[PDB]
Every structure is written in C-alpha cells, then in structure tokens.
Amino acid sequence: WVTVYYGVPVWKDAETTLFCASHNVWATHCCVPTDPNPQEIVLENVTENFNMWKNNMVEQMHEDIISLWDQSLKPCVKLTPLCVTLNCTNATASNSSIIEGMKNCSFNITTELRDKREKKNALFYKLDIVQLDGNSSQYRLINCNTSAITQACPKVSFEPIPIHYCAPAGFAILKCNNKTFTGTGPCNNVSTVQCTHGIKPVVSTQLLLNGSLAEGEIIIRSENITDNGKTILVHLNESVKIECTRPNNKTRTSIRIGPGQAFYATGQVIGDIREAYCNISESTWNETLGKVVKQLRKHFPHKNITFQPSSGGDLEVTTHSFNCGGEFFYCNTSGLFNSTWDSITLPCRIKQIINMWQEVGRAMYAPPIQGNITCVSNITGLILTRDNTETFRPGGGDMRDNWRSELYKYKVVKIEPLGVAPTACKRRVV
Amino acid sequence: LWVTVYYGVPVWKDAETTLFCASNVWATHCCVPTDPNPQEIVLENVTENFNMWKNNMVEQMHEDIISLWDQSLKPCVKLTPLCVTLNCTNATASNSSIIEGMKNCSFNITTELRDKREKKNALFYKLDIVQLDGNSSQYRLINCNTSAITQACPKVSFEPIPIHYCAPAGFAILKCNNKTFTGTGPCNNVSTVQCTHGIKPVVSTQLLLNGSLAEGEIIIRSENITDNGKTILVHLNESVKIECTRPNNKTRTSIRIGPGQAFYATGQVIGDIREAYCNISESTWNETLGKVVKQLRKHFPHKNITFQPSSGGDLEVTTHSFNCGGEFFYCNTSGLFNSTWDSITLPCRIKQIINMWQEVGRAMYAPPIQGNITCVSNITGLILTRDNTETFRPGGGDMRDNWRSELYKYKVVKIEPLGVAPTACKRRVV
Amino acid sequence: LWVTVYYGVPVWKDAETTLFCASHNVWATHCCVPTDPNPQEIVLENVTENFNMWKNNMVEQMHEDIISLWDQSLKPCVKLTPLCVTLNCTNATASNSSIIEGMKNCSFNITTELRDKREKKNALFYKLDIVQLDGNSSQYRLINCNTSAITQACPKVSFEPIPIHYCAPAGFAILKCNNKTFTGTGPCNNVSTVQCTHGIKPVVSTQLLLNGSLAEGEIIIRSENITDNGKTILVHLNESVKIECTRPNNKTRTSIRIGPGQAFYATGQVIGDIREAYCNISESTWNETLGKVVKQLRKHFPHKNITFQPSSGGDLEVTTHSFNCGGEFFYCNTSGLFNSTWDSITLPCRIKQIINMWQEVGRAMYAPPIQGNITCVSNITGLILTRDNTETFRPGGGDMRDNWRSELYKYKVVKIEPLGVAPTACKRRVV
Amino acid sequence: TMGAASMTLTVQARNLLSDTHWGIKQLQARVLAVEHYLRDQQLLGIWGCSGKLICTTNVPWNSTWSNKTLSEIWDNMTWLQWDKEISNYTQIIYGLLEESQNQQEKNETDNLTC
Amino acid sequence: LGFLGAAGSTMGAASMTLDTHWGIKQLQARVLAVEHYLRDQQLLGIWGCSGKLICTTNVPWNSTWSNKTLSEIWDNMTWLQWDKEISNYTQIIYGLLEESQNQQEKNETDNLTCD
Amino acid sequence: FLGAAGSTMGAASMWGIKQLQARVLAVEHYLRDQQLLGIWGCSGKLICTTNVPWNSTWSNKTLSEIWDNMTWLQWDKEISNYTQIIYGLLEESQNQQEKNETDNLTC
Amino acid sequence: XXXXXXXXXXXXXXXXXXXXXCXXXXXXXXXXXXXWXXXXXXXXXXXXXXXXXXXXXXXXXXXXXXXXXXXXXXXXXXXXXXXXXXXXXXXXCXXXXXXXXXXXXXXXXXXXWXXXXXXXX
Amino acid sequence: XXXXXXXXXXXXXXXXXXXXXCXXXXXXXXXXXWXXXXXXXXXXXXXXXXXXXXXXXXXXXXXXXXXXXXXXXXXXXXXXXXXXXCXXXXXXXXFXXXXXXXX
C-alpha cells in the first residue's frame, strides 16, 4: 500500500536567489538585519557532495556586487566635460628634481555658464594620462576615447562590512564542517544553516586579504591540480601581517564643471618622494613560504619548485591591486615571489581612473584623499598559477577567487517535503 | 479550564502600511475609483487613541505627493542651455514707464542646429535673477549654479482634486468623530471607514486655504502648547473669503532651445497696474482673529495677546504663498497679524523659478500664463507659532503640517482576526 | 431537491489579459521563453463560440509589445544629435556620369573624442532624408532633427521576423477558430482550445502583407463591413505570390567618432550600378491573383468593370510598399500593379535611412548602411485594400495593426471560471 | 448528462497553479493567478466545501428563479448553457450558501456538543 | 451588520466570529495580503483545524494566567480588551496549541485504522 | 529543522523585482504542494494512507528491506523515476473515491 | 622659472590703504603661498600674506594685510591699513610651495622675489 | 624670534665669515633663512632653511638648531660682498636687520 508523507527532511541541489543581510554602501543596500543568534544544526550521518568550483553562490555574489557598485556610482558627478586636450609638463618638486609618476596638466574647461571657459590645472598620475602624438606635450585622460568616466561621490564609503547570504523560504544552506576538505567531493561532517557567516567583500589581486584562516594546516585548492591551465588557491592557516602606506598629505582643488558638478583633483602633494609602499615582515613571509612549499611538493614530489613574478599583462594582473582607505594601490610583489626550493618593502603605485571589473563600459574616478594613509591587513591566502621544476607565479583571476575562497564551504539546496513509501495498511474509508 | 481558538474576531492592533490613492496628474495617477457610498460603521462602546502629530499618513501623503510632482515634471523640457550671461535692462510695459519687478534680458542660445546661435529676448522677474557683477548689467538665473531647472509641460495644471486614501486588504482606517477633538489621546466616538474623505492637496504656508471647517468652535491644536518651538494649527469653524489676482494681461512667446525643446519666455506686459495683490474683508478678518485669541487665552489666560507680523526668515517662510491659475504668488500678510488684543489689500509678488520642498534639485520653471488671473479661495485655518504677554507669529512650517490638519481624524490599523479565549471544553474523540 | 456545488467546471468568459511570448537577436533575447514541443489542441463539440477579429484585444497587446521591444532595444545606443549641424552638400559622383540621382555628398564640422576639437567629415545621404534650409542654397539639415530624437540602430542587435507564439497565463485559455470560411466575425461552429497560438512572424509592411499564413479558402475577404467605405479590407490568398526585391549595389561604410565609445556609421562611397532599387513580381502570377480577388469582390460588389487605382497620396509610408529588406528600408512604387479594370513586372523602389517606424514620431531610428548587395526574396500572402456607379479600390491601409490582425483572427482569450453555481442533486450530508 | 465531466474537475483544478517593464508585467500575472486561486478556495471554505471538488448544501432552490427540472434532460449537456441560465442568480445563490453555513455554525457553535 | 460591526462587544456577548515605482508598491501590497492570509491558514492547520470558525483543542488553561474564573473572563470583558489583557502569553498559548497537536500527531502516528 | 536527515525511514518522525520574485515563488511552491495534497484527499495530514497498492515494479524489496534499512534520501533516489506515476495514481484513486461518494440515490 | 612682477606702484594719501597687486608669472598661482615684503627704507621686516595653496589669508604684523591670492587673476593682492609716509619703500612679492610636490613642511622662506614697487603714502 | 642676528658688518677680502648666527632670541623653530644683496634689488636666498643650501648656491655655508645658526659663508670673497640678513620662516614673522657685511 502507498503512504503519502509530508514534511520529509529531504532536498535537491538548487539555484535560487539569496538575500543580502548586514554613508556606507554595503550597509545601505543590505539593510536587512542579521540573526543575532544564528543556529547551526549538525546532521548526523549525512554525506553531501560539494564543489566550490561550480558553486553558483560565487556567481551570485559577483553579480550583486557589480550591481551595487554601479548603483552607488551612477548618481554622482560625470566627468565628460573634462575630456579635452591637456597641456602636460614635468611635475617639478620643491627638490631640484621632478617627482616621477606625476604630470602637471592644464586645460580649458567650460564652467557653469556656457559662455565661459577657464584655464584650470591639476596634477595627475602618469598612469592615467595618454599621449596623443609623439614628440608632443598634448595628452588626454586614458579612458575618454573608450567609455564614460564617473567621479565617485565623496560622501559614499565602500568600506566592506561582513555580508551574510541568506536562503529564502523553502531553501536552506548546507555547510561543510570537515577542516581538511579540499573543495570538491563528499563532505562527511555537514550541518544546516539559514545564512552564511559574514564575509567581507574584498577586492584584491594576487594575494588574498582579510579572509578566514584554514585549520588543519595549509590547504592547496584547485579545480584540477594536475592541470596547469587552472588556478591554485592557497589557503593559509596563519596570517601574514601586511602594513601599507602612502607617506604623504595631498591637497585638492575643486573645479566646478556644471550646476553643482564638483570635480576634485590633486592640487599639490606634500610629503615623501616615495609615492607608496608596503611593509611585510621578512621572517613571517619566509616561514609562510616554507610551509606552502612543503604542501605544494606533496602534489609535485621529487621535483624542485620556484616562485617567480607575474609574467605579463596590465597593472591589475601584474601588481597587487587593492583598496587602501579609499585609495587605489598597485604594488610590486616581485620582492616576495622570487625564490627556489627584518622586513621587505614593496614599492607601490597609485592610480585614479580605475575599472577593477571585466567591464570597461564605465570607469570610476577616485577623487584625491587628504591626510596620510596607513592600512593594516591580514594576508590569508595566495593566488597561484602553475607553469625538472615547476614554476608558480602570483597571477590574477576574475576576482571570483575572492569569494570562492570563502564560499567553498556552502551549498544551496531546495527542500522537498513530499514523498511516498510502501506500507501494509490500506486507507480506511468511512 | 480548556482553550478555544476563534477566527474572524473583530479586533485590531495599531499599524503602518501603504495606502493606495483613489479618486492633470492627480486623476491620472490616482486612477483607481472610490466607493460612492462609503459604508461608515459606528462602533458601539469603543475608545481609541489618536495622534495627529505621530500619524504616519501625513508623512506618506507627503512623500507620494513629491513623487508624483517629480514624475510629472521629469518628461519635459530642460532649461540647461539658458545658463548664459544675460544682458538685462529695466523692462517697460504698454504703460510707458518702468516695471520695478521686471527685467528685460537679452541672451545668446543654441538654436535648432548645434552650430548656430541666436540672440533672444525674454522678460524675467527680479526674483528669478541674480547679478554676476556689481555695477554691471551681467546676470544669471538664480538656480543655475545650484541645480538643473526643468520647465513644466504646459499641458499639466496640477490642480488639486480631492484625494482619498484607501486601506489595502487586511487593514482598515479608523475615524474620530469627536467635534472637539484636539488631535491627541482617547476619542470616545469612533467609526471605521474604507477610505478617508477626499482631501485636496492644496499647498500654502501661513494661511491654510480650502478643506473642511471645524464642526465645533475654533480648535487650536498643538503637540505641546507650552513649547514655543511647536506648530500651532488653528482650525476655524467659519471660513474667510480671500480674493487674489494678477490684473495685468501677460503675453508669451516660444523659444526653441535645441531640437524638439522650447522655452516659454515671457513676451510682454500690457495693462500694467500692480504685479499682484489679495483682498480679505476687514470685518470678517477682525472677528475671526478675535475669536482665535479668545481661544488662545484659555491656554494663556490673563494676558493681552499681540501679533508679530511676517515673523522672519526667507521669502518662502515670511511671505504667504500659493498656486493661482498656474502662477506662483508670494503675498505680504503683515497687515493681517500686527494687531493688539471695508477690506485689506495685501501687496503680492510673482516668481517663475519655483523651489517647493526642501530639495532644490529639479527646480521648476513655471511657463508664464497669458492674460489676467483671478482666484477665490477659503481661509480655513492658520499656522501660528509662539514668540509680559504672549506674542504670536504667523508663519510657515514643514509642508507636512498642511496635511496634519486634514488627516488628524484618521488612523491606520491592522486587523487581527485570530485569537484565543477560554471555554472549559476539551476536544472530543481525543 | 438541494444545490450541489462543483469546482473544476469547464466554463469560460471573454477576457483581456497579459500574454507572454514563446520561441544577439532582439526577439530571441526578449521572447526567451521556449515553446511546447508537443502542443495540444482540444476539440469542442457544438460550441458556437463568437469571434471578432476587429475587436480582438490580442492584436492590441501584440502591438504594444512590439513597440515596447523596439524602443527598449534601440534605447541603449548611440544618439545622433551631434550630427545636427548645417550640412554643406554637393552632387554625389560615385558614378562615371558624376551623378547618382538619389544621393547627395554632405560635409560637416563635428566634435570628436576630444571635446575641444571639431573636424570636417563627410558622408553620402539619400535625398529623402536631407532638408534644404533655404532656396538656392547648399545648406542642409537632417530631416526631422529639429522635431525629434534620432537614435542610431546598433549592429550588435539583430532584427528579423522570428515567429512568436503567444501563450496564456494560468487561469486563461486561448480558443481557436477552425472554420475555413469564418470571415472575420460571428459564431465559429468548429472550435478548439489551445494554450499558445501558432508562431506569428512580426513582419511589418504597408500595402502587401508578406510572409504570413495562406487562406484555406481560395481567397477570403475580411472587413468589419464591406459596404462601409470607411473601413479597410484584408484579402487573404491561398497561394503565395513571389516578389524579389533587389538593391544591386555595394556600399562602402565609414565611421565617424563622435564621443567616448560613440560612433556614427555612414555611407562613404558607392561602388556601381546606378539603379537604386527595384522589385521583380511575377507578371502572370499577379494577373491571375488579381483576377481571383475580383471574382471574390463580385460577390459583394456585383458590378462589371470594377477598377483598381494607386494609393491616392500622403507620404511614403502610405503611398508606397514599405518593408525591411535586410537592414535597408525600401519604399517601392506599386502603381504598376494597382492599375486595371476588371514574364515579370519591375517596381521602381527607393531607399530611406531615417525611419519613423511607428505612428509616434517624436523619435526616429537611423539605419546604418549595409555593406554588400541585397536580394530579399519574399511572398505576398495577402493584400490590404481600401475603397473610394462602379467602385474603385486602392492599396491603402491602416495603423499597421492590420499586420497582426491578419494572423490573429482565429484566436481569442477567455478566462477560466471553474466554480459552478447551482445544479441540483441530493439533500445535505448532515452528520 | 455532465457525468463524465465530473472526472475532469481535478484536471482543470491542477492547471490553475503551474526588461523592468516586463518584470512588472510578469509579477502581476503570477500574483493574479494566485489571487484567483485563493479567492475560489476562500469561497469554498466559507461555504463549508473546503477539500471538495463536489459538495452539497441546504438552500431553498427558490421557485422565483428555479423552474421544474427534468429526468437528466434539464440537467443539461452543456455547462456554458448553465452559465447563461443559472448564473443569472449567482449573486443571490452565493449569499444563500454563506448564510446556510452561518446557520449551521449558529446551530452548533458552542451551544451543543463539546 | 458591517465589516467589524460591534467590535466593542462583551466576551459574554461575543456571539460568533464572522509607473514602475507605483507598480512595485502595488505588488508588494498584494503579496503581503496573500502572505498574511496564508500564514493564518497555515497556523490554524498546524493546530489541528481548518474550515472551522471555532476550534476546540486539548490544551488546559494555566489558571495563574488569568488568575480568574471563567464566569468573569469569558463574560465581563470586551474582545478588544481581551486582546489587551492576554499579557504577553500569546506565544505561550500558541506554543501549547502546537504541543497538543503534536501529541495528537504522535498518537495518530501508529495509524492502524486500516482495512 | 532537518533533524536526522541521515537516517532511515524507520526513524522517520516530525532589487525590488528580485525580492518580489523570491516572495512570489515561495508562495507558489507552498500552494502547489497544498493543492496536490488536497487533490489526493490528504489535506491537513502529515501521514495519509491511500487506496493505491504498492507496486513491485516501483520496488520489489520488502518492508524490512525498505524501511529501517534505507535513508530517506536513498529512497527518493531509488524510486525517483516513479514519482509521477504514483502521483498520477493517487489523483485517480481520489477521483474514483469521489465518483462513488457522488453517486446518486445515496447522499 | 617664476618671474613675479613688481607690485602696482602708488603715491597714496597719507594713512590711505596701501592697495597694490603683483602679477604672477611662470608659476602656478593656484599654489605658491604668497607674501608681501614689509618694505621699509632700511630693510623689510615681516610680511602681509595669502595663499591659494591653503585657501587662506593672514593678518600682517602691523597695520593690516587685506591680502588675497587671486589665482584666477594671476596676481597677489594686499591693502594694508593706514599707510605711513614712512611706508614709502618698495615691497617685493614672492611665493613658497609653487612646486607640484613639496619635500618638506611649509616652514621655509619664499625666494622668488619681484623687482618690487613703493607706495609713496 | 623677534630679535636680530649678531651682525656688525664684519667683512674680509676672503672667507668673510660674519657668522651673526641668526640669534633671533634662539627661537627660530629651525627655520632660519638667509638672503643677500649688493644692489638695489631684492635679496637672493643665500641659504635655504637651516643648514640647507640655497638652490644654485656657491661659496656659502649655513647651520641651525633654531638658534646658533652659524653661517660662515664658506671661504667666500667676491661672493660675500653683499649685505646680508637672517629670517625665521617659521617663527614670529621674524627678520633681522643684521648687517652690511659687504667687504
């Protein structure tokens, strides 16, 4: 005899929309409060197959972050009227030298009244200025021939806050609690939660900053370790302290380019001559690599390995790119990834017109920040590309790696309360 | 002794929700019809607590009005190209003299083709224009350096029509029928309604125009009375007739300001007498104000009350204002509120650039209206503030205070049909 | 005897609801929902269901969705406002004769990606879209710029007549008429129920209906009132009439940068073979087809010597046969067909670039030039006629809704009403 | 005699439940399908027919609109005819059905039985 | 009588119970009305009834809760007051209603009432 | 919430657009399951027996082999390809039950 | 590079404000904190000052500065109160921090001094 | 710093080290500065703040610790034939008349 049951504790793999739970853009958008007393239920004897490389929670996070970033930037000052020929010269220092990396550019900008144009000037980073002709002082902003450039609002903060992704009714999130789980295959110790832990969105290349730590030693995670066409994420069990700074105090000039359209640009720089740098303890970094190497060689035994600098491409992929107090740093990591198997200074560059997304349809302009900047952050992992000996390089990625490394423990499933089973008890009628 | 569950129980809890708007912009948006015979239900032996100062319907009506205002203005002509230097002189009229309040401005604008320019003339009010220099005829429009100005489409009058706010399913609106209700606390004669009565969204400052009169004697409503920082809403039981006009016959032109778009400039003024004025009967005003004082003295007894005419602050605060026939009037009330306790003419001015509400973005340009304009309105209430006897000032207040005077009798409540009560009966057959 | 209440009752009423579509293209992107690979049809017995194509709300819903998608698709594209400058125009000399008749060579000063710089650029434009600013002058402007927003169509998105099925939402059903001679209005005595319509190709034309369904009856003439000269007559044929429309030339496209990722496309040069455009319509097919239409008209108009005349006047949208031949908009002269009293015929044809498209003209679309030659092969499935002693017919037309009404004449939407009211049986099941 | 049709009631009932501008239109369509479904279930509920495709009541079946029935002839072959002949009284019949259930509740709220 | 009718009724006389932005607001209002309806129905179903106006269950009263006789609490108090007087015991009653239905579900689990 | 999901049946016991879509779907899923239980005549029940016999074609194992020794999750997989068959049979058995209840001269 | 111009010359009434301005040249007038030498027959001492560089101005050690950095007009300006007849000495204009970047805090003397001009009060 | 340098117009044919040492009340906030002229012209910076050299300096010397800012002028001869004076860029808007130590 058939018996119908309802409320049966079973589920299927599923893809749904999760909701985001908690001046600050993240706080403003993810207005939904978190559970102050979240529960986790251990499921006795449940084996569940996880695959962090096929996890749609990662794609969702990618899409929602871009959408928020665009929504935040959209209602701000457009820099279109500034796409004019610039007359650029050498950014002479108070020293009998030219400060490198900067240009002193002047231009004729239309103001609030359409009958007037004024000569204005500002200092710009060399990286964002493109030469129009050889043997010429005439330049243009780097993105004025490709796409719109919008100035980020000075009243909006992009500083990350922990974000919790929560399943909607009818869904649950399964979490893997096996400390040595490598990202794919069965997890033999699982639990059910409604929301993920709080993950701070972090935008970083090459090195993984401000994430969680591994337990049970360093874990080498890859879609396919043998296949050298894929990225290896190294998840560390101990952090490396990194201190980044911009040892100067900038002053800015405000140019009105329309009816309340205030454009900000560097007026002058007071301070050191090093534009930026990062301080990494030498012994900490050296111990970290020895431990990473010990683990890499268990996958590639009886071979020597080496760490080399990123092989090529633009600044976002060849340097360590990150947001430091609202400023954008592009640091040289060749001082770290140069070995074969007290502190280290990484020189850093600063850029103002940035993308940091695969989309180039719009660029963000970062207005100058007054005051000096110091950032202290935790390196929790590495992004490596493998290329006898093996070569590992601090390569880049699609920025999904910054979420794959935290969301590897979670899977979304649909709850299916109905089902049937046999018995030996016919329905009684009347 | 035992529990019984009841459903469909006529009980409720205080609540906030979204009400819908039900029966130009007003009729276009509030397209939903109303009940021609609302079934008001008298509630026998029910006492409810009402609070007009904390009633969120005031805030909701306010926000919906703003949204509609902006939706209507948005798909219209931009006046951006008019941010040019204006070369202005003293405007004349059919009367061969000088209009003190008008300037005759010439300016250079973009025409149908982008490579062509034309010199145009237009008349503006002194209150629409600010000088760019000292002793020189070089001017700009007042809001050019603050925000975009959008011209209202001539097809929309925005004339107030009664608006009814209706509860969504699961909600009801409670109404207070106490003729002496002061705006807060228990109401001992209540009823329920499906929708509020129709309230016209009339905008004014010092004198509240149109709407219903008090059933009882003049009621003075205040959140505190004692606190001089609170708004005092005086609701009259008898109206005062006010007749306002612009006797001058205006004519207008149309200036193309680029492809598609055109500016409705003022052309000429003929039959010039006075820019504007309002007439209030003298006997009516004096008795009406005397009765208000008679009631103020019940809160402030044994004191000889005086008024301080026009208060202080900006034009929008000290001057009475309203929309009359599509044009915006700014009338001087100093002769109404300077007393100590056959008609009075109030001098009045006109503006073309309008900035209602606290936000000055999307400033509206009011096209001129050809011919002469007259309006007859009903003064239904006063807005007074306080500040050895008491001194009162006419004055403005938040725009929300205009609907507080109409919505004070209504409250939003959620119906809660489920409940439990004792029977001392146990379920039969286990 | 007491009332029995039933739920799941096969009853319905006339209704208007939102229908949805079912299957780089614009339609494929919007009408993303798949079709039923095994569609069902339920045959009804003795149901004299009333149909009315003229008042059928499915036509209006289809029209509005077409307009909406067209605008949604065009909106995220390059604006051509920067080009609305005085044009300095001379003779286009692509030919050996130094004249190509239908086009002019126009020069203009336009702002480049550097906002402080303007450059002299030029392009060839059709005469149909260029407006002279004054008499005896070389100074011209783009047509309709001063009254409209002109937006360039983007090559990134494809537009082609992909057949779309319209499907009812749950709670609704579409009834279909299977009477071969139904003729527009009245009861259809052989009907069925479906969930989706057949696929209708969103083909847009003005005089001759192209790439539609063929009639089951030899020819069927449909109108609200054929004796009412204020109404349009739709004539559906059971045979396809083949017409081949050609643009026997090759345009060389150029590109003018106008802003930060913004560019304008225009014809820079024309290779050769001066005839601008023409259409080849079979002569014998047409003669037979038109005579057959008359045979059917004679049953409503039993008069000898009934005649046909060319469209009487108005702009190209109503005087010519308009269609999209493959990125180019053809406006062909059909006066060579509609001129008679009751191996091929070449219809002279012109090409236009700035297209109003719809009845709403506050905006217009600019069609970028198409490289290579065009040979569009299509068939006439029906004609649109209007009428003015012995009567005269003309290739006149409606508001372009006729184009979908001509397919949506078999379908109507009804609301399912599953709850019955009061049949009787039994008493009551007390205790 | 609509006998066979009673076995299709289930089939019809189960078919009732399963670009910003477009998104609004799609949400409205989904919401309305739900509202129509629930409106019918709520009505069957108030009449005391919840859980049944076929149920009976106690109403007067009044001679002011009800004519004499026939031996499975009157009980018509076509539902669409009843939609024109019986439906004319829907607005009174539905009211009678609610009242008959209200009377049943009154007879057995808490006065009798436990 | 009316939608709420005699809301001010004594318990002893209880008798018996009986355009895009705008588009988003309207959809939210419709959705919430549906959710509230369904939550009441789900809540009653899990307490052992639906289709009933009045449900009797296997839950005793605390008698410390009201600390009063039935002859006063199911008599000289208005339903509106009744709600006010529950004194934050609602969630206790609801929990108890679930517990007793759960006990019934446990007693009906053997389900041997078959052919 | 799930409790002993890892147990055998023998142990069985008891932006605006995106947000609106999530809410609407939660409602649609709820209602679809409730409608289906109503169709089978199992409205309001957590456990409901029926008049459909168990088929050996769905599973030829006995109760001591199916209950006690199979995980709910394993069971659903074992008979996943019969779910639509059993559900169709359940609807028809209720239709037949109604057919008899609604027969005439009975009440 | 900088070539500050001599201040507008004057022959002011006694106790008139010492109103004058120095045209800027070959320098960013948008930076270049400026100072007016407090000229005297023997030696200048202290100065009036203003700076585009810091959106600021300051009072003079004596009389008044009434100083401004008119970056827009490419000129320094000042108008000290009560010019003494003894103030009839030429004052040079100069500025500090005219550089794109400074290697030090603003605690250094200006060097780019103008030819100067006197106001014969 | 409202005090003068200890200058007495001392001078020499060579090495005219009239090191007045900018003794401006010993409170120059280490912003001592020097300038000189031998013409009816603005004085040119002789030295940059404290010990720092003036741009394009020659035949010159400087020191400072906000006090005792010795400035021996290297071994300057013709180069030293100018009047010279001290200032404190960061203190009291100070200036020292100092002396015409112009050989």
Ligand SMILES: *[C@@H]1O[C@H](CO)[C@@H](O[C@@H]2O[C@H](CO)[C@@H](O[C@@H]3O[C@H](CO)[C@@H](O)[C@H](O)[C@H]3NC(C)=O)[C@H](O)[C@H]2NC(C)=O)[C@H](O)[C@H]1NC(C)=O
């Ligand atoms: C399978 O995963 C489970 C997580 O879902 C692991 O269970 C966790 O074990 C922790 C250590 O025993 C517990 O931490 C303690 O919790 C109590 C309160 O419950 C606190 O007072 C203690 O301070 C805290 N201990 C410390 C050091 O902070 C976790 O609470 C517990 N989590 C849950 C949900 O039960 C299992 O151990 C793991 N099994 C295997 C085989 O790895």
Ligand SMILES: *[C@@H]1O[C@H](CO)[C@@H](O[C@@H]2O[C@H](CO)[C@@H](O[C@@H]3O[C@H](CO)[C@@H](O)[C@H](O)[C@H]3NC(C)=O)[C@H](O)[C@H]2NC(C)=O)[C@H](O)[C@H]1NC(C)=O
């Ligand atoms: C408590 O509130 C009640 C409303 O909620 C008030 O009831 C109203 O009293 C009016 C008489 O004072 C009634 O007027 C009648 O309206 C009908 C409309 O069609 C006319 O024909 C009648 O002629 C007219 N009556 C008279 C004497 O002219 C209102 O209809 C009635 N409202 C309702 C909904 O019943 C109570 O009076 C009020 N109690 C106190 C103490 O203020």
Ligand SMILES: *[C@@H]1O[C@H](CO)[C@@H](O[C@@H]2O[C@H](CO)[C@@H](O[C@@H]3O[C@H](CO)[C@@H](O)[C@H](O)[C@@H]3O)[C@H](O)[C@H]2NC(C)=O)[C@H](O)[C@H]1NC(C)=O
């Ligand atoms: C208070 O309410 C009164 C009505 O009771 C409002 O007066 C009305 O105002 C409108 C708009 O100005 C007038 O409409 C116009 O009438 C002229 C007549 O020639 C017509 O040409 C215009 O096209 C337009 O229709 C209306 O006539 C007038 N009503 C009366 C009786 O005079 C008054 O404006 C309201 N007050 C406030 C402050 O809102």
Ligand SMILES: *[C@@H]1O[C@H](CO)[C@@H](O[C@@H]2O[C@H](CO)[C@@H](O)[C@H](O)[C@H]2NC(C)=O)[C@H](O)[C@H]1NC(C)=O
């Ligand atoms: C880490 O930062 C500190 C400053 O915060 C750097 O310290 C200076 O290093 C220079 C090197 O030439 C020394 O001359 C300074 O005396 C140091 N200052 C202090 C206060 O000690 C340090 O060098 C940075 N780390 C690295 C690797 O450069």
Ligand SMILES: *[C@@H]1O[C@H](CO)[C@@H](O)[C@H](O)[C@H]1NC(C)=O
């Ligand atoms: C404004 O100035 C123009 C100048 O040509 C003159 O023709 C016009 O009459 C003047 N109008 C008024 C009102 O002064």
Ligand SMILES: *[C@@H]1O[C@H](CO)[C@@H](O)[C@H](O)[C@H]1NC(C)=O
């Ligand atoms: C002042 O107050 C007295 C009552 O105390 C009143 O009679 C008198 O009329 C008042 N004065 C004026 C000007 O109204």
Ligand SMILES: *[C@@H]1O[C@H](CO)[C@@H](O)[C@H](O)[C@H]1NC(C)=O
């Ligand atoms: C159009 O004019 C340009 C002017 O430089 C010329 O080069 C081009 O050949 C002309 N093309 C035609 C078809 O006349």
